[PDB]
Design a protein around this ligand. Structure first.
Ligand code: MN
Length: 616
């Protein structure tokens, strides 16, 4: 895990370096030295920038602690940004080197001078930034080496044995400098780090697939972004190498697929075999690996796996891309299966396509999906009054429309709620299992800079017009449309740190909603105090009104008939007197109408609130 840290620095630099160089040459850092505290729009106007893409770049610089952002939302330089002058722009040549030919012995001493500058730490006094620049050298080469498994043991043929004398010599120097090899027994031999790097090479396939977009990021930020992102004459994407991207998604999503085992077993060990689903529909099936791995868990480890004849099961793969449809059919050629054109954004049309293929009982479907709700077509929000209720919440996401302009976070969140509302209307008693990936706040990304992927991942999702939100905002959006996690099956990653980047939730429909408490709700929250406490132990309308304005996202409400049945308030005060910890006051106040206690709604609200607080 202290080796993933090295990989993480490489993938960070792969994205960060061209963003840094584009901003430098446009004048971003000079502008902030001349005029300081500037808002986003002040900089957009001075630079002629695309405001959405430029906000993605600002978030990344804040996450490096190169910029700070004040309470008026105005940016200024920090002292760490000064290293930006030392970076040489010709490093950008590494994105197009012909690495495969070089490994074939057909390009001479191509990497010699780059490897020498890496041995000098790129003439920076900053080892961290030297690692960032190393990523532009390492990642294309790692992927090329993985092609032919060149970065592997003395499997009767020693380390660099199959290559030309020139490339043995240049790669031998790099590997020894990176710690990928050592001189055991007088020969060049792989180390643990070098074996680890070869095995994990495909973790870098996703940032590498964005190379066309990254080598044009000047135009994304400051030019006609549409000459990027516009599609082929054959209809393929130009900002990305989609076939390498999918190979990368697949390799990386595997370790989360296995953790779906407990949820899948809980469904197919469920007592009456007759009440189990008849179909498993994976929306965004890609290459079909998740459906295959699911099918094998059921066949060989579940009760239903012993009753496939009385109780047939059929896998259904939905995807928008023709190539994924063809790939899934091959992966699932041995299994009972159906494959359909369809879209994450249109679950009703998926239901209509299922009928055309003979499936008229969609109430017997278990729905699953991984890493796809963020990659949907933006549909602007249509519930205008609901949009205005949430306009004051401090959401911390960044999303770009197809004109390069910033989508306001509350508009994006209202659009996610309407998207999950469409899904809740086709979900049935068997529920909906979702793996999803989330963004973080810049202050948190810097504190854990090389413990997580967010610095580069959140950037290239932002640039490519995909829509990440915080773990707990996704959770709150499902609950506002009546979908709730089965808490004992949920998982959050990374398990060992106080932030959440990935969530696994098996959502369940329930006959209520959970929402934030707003100011319009204040009468009903006052009455809830009268109905829940004796007159001496009641909170004051002053106190309650405080809680709604200090912590608008710290107070949850359970609604039934447009009636507020219960409310829960969390508040924490830290003393202002003078990693370690000082004087604090912590308060958690649950109100539930006597009417509804026996059903346990108090328990369900309290338990939801504790998991929401853990995701935060
Ligand atoms: Mn994505």
């Amino acid at each position: 895990n202290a080796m993933l840290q090295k990989i993480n620095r490489y993938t960070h630099g792969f994205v960060a370096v061209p963003v840094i160089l584009a901003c430098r040459e446009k004048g971003v850092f000079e502008l902030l030295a001349d005029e300081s505290p500037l808002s986003l729009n002040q900089m957009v106007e001075h630079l002629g920038a695309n405001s959405g893409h430029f906000q993605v770049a600002l978030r990344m610089l804040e996450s490096l602690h190169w910029l700070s952002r004040n309470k008026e939302l105005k940016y200024s330089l920090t002292a760490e940004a000064a290293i930006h002058n030392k970076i040489s722009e010709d490093i950008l040549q590494l994105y197009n080197l012909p690495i495969q030919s070089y490994l074939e012995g057909k390009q001479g001493n191509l990497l010699g001078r780059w490897i020498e500058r890496s041995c000098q730490l790129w003439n920076l006094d900053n080892p961290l930034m030297a690692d960032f620049l190393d990523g532009l050298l390492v990642i294309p080469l790692l992927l090329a080496l993985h092609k032919h498994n060149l970065l592997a043991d003395s499997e009767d043929k020693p380390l660099l044995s199959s290559l030309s004398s020139t490339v043995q010599e240049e790669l031998g120097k790099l590997f020894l400098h990176l710690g990928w090899a050592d001189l055991t027994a007088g020969r060049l031999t792989i180390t643990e780090l070098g074996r680890f790097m070869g095995e994990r090479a495909l973790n870098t396939a996703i940032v590498a697939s964005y190379t066309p977009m990254l080598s044009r990021i000047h135009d994304v930020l400051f030019g006609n972004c549409l000459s990027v992102f516009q599609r082929d004459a054959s209809g393929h994407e130009r900002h990305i190498d989609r076939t390498l991207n999918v190979i990368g998604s697949g390799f990386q999503h595997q370790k989360y697929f296995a953790d779906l085992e407990e949820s899948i077993l809980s469904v197919f060990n469920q007592l009456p075999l007759e009440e189990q689903p008849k179909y498993i529909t994976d929306m965004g099936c890609g290459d079909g690996t998740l459906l295959k791995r699911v099918w094998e868990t059921i066949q060989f480890k579940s009760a239903r796996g012993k009753a496939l004849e009385q109780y047939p099961l059929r896998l259904i793969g939905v995807d928008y891309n023709e190539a994924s449809l063809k790939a899934t059919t091959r992966t699932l050629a041995s299994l009972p299966h159906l494959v359909l054109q369809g879209d994450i954004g249109n679950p009703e049309q998926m239901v209509r396509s299922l009928e055309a293929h003979g499936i008229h009982d969609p109430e017997n479907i278990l729905h699953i999906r991984s890493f796809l709700d963020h990659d949907r077509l933006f549909i602007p929000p249509q519930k205008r009054n609901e949009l205005k209720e949430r306009a004051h919440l401090p959401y911390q996401s960044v999303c770009v429309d197809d004109q390069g302009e910033l989508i306001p976070p509350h508009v994006m969140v209202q659009s996610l709620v309407e998207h999950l509302e469409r899904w809740s209307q086709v979900v049935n008693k068997h529920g909906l299992m979702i793996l999803e990936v989330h963004c973080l706040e810049p202050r948190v990304v810097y504190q854990f800079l090389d413990k997580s992927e967010n610095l580069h991942f959140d950037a290239h999702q932002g640039f490519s017009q995909q829509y990440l939100v915080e773990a707990e905002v996704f959770l709150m959006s499902a609950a506002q449309v009546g979908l709730f996690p089965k808490l004992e099956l949920s998982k959050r990653y990374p398990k060992t740190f106080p932030f959440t980047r990935i969530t696994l939730n098996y959502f369940e429909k329930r006959p209520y909603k959970i929402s934030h408490a707003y100011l319009s709700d204040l009468p009903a929250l006052v009455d809830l105090e009268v109905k829940c406490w004796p007159e001496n132990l009641r909170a004051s309308t002053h106190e309650i009104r405080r809680r709604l304005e200090l912590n608008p996202q710290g107070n949850l409400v359970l609604i039934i008939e447009d009636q507020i049945i219960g409310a829960i308030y969390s508040q924490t005060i830290t003393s202002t007197e003078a990693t370690p910890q000082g004087s604090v006051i912590q308060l958690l106040a649950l109100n539930i109408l006597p009417e509804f206690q026996a059903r346990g709604l108090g328990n369900e609200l309290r338990d939801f609130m504790l998991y929401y607080c853990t995701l935060k």
